[PDB]
Amino acid sequence: HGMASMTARPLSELVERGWAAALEPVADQVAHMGQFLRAEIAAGRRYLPAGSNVLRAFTFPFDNVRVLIVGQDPYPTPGHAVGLSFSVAPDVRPWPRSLANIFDEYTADLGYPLPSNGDLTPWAQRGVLLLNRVLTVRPSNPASHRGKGWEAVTECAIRALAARAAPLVAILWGRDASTLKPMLAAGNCVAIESPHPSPLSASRGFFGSRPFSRANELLVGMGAEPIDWRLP
Ligand SMILES: [Cl-]
Ligand SMILES: [Cl-]
Ligand SMILES: [Cl-]
């Protein structure tokens, strides 16, 4: 299921059952995004990630999400984005510099060895929502799908998480992510804020932020299970 399905089929057929219910308020908006993508292709433009990966962050169970990591837009280099914020496919070398920064801090914070590859799927399988606010991008055109309708989709997702009584930690990287604080404050959600891991900002405070260990300390305090951050 790709673009065709996103334009034409119910949420139940696109994402995990809990997510499908959570995203029901934006069912028409999702369909409209599928049409936007169809129009892009008809016009002789491409988009990233692959259609089958666009909604991938919502294919893991809504009820198990305990940490939210927000990204802005997918990687713009062809072949990098795979539908989970910051993740890349296992064969990708070198890693994008933002991911290399995230992994630098992972090693410093947790003491684990540097990951073998850039695939963050294990995090998604273990209750981390790796959510870009904008879920597609035109190749090599950073932030080119901003303002095209994804924002309402991804905001609906975040509000559904925040509305729950269940524990949530939100890792908020950069000023744009920090815009989410109001919706997060009225819930059972603690936000960890730092500069973004992009090389443009990382050295102003991303390094040293220890988000992984902090998120776990917060979770355990709230009686939730921590995340097993360990990557192979
Ligand atoms: Cl189609
Ligand atoms: Cl293109
Ligand atoms: Cl991405």
UniProtKB/Swiss-Prot annotation:
Listed CDD domains: UDG-F1-like
GO cellular component: cytoplasm
GO biological process, one term: base-excision repair, AP site formation via deaminated base removal
Keyword Cytoplasm: yes
This protein's UniProt keywords: Cytoplasm, DNA damage, DNA repair, Hydrolase
MF GO annotations: uracil DNA N-glycosylase activity
Pfam families from the UniProt entry: UDG (PF03167)
UniProt subcellular location: Cytoplasm
Reactions that this protein is recorded to catalyse: Hydrolyzes single-stranded DNA or mismatched double-stranded DNA and polynucleotides, releasing free uracil
PANTHER family, A to Z: URACIL-DNA GLYCOSYLASE
Protein name (database record): Uracil-DNA glycosylase
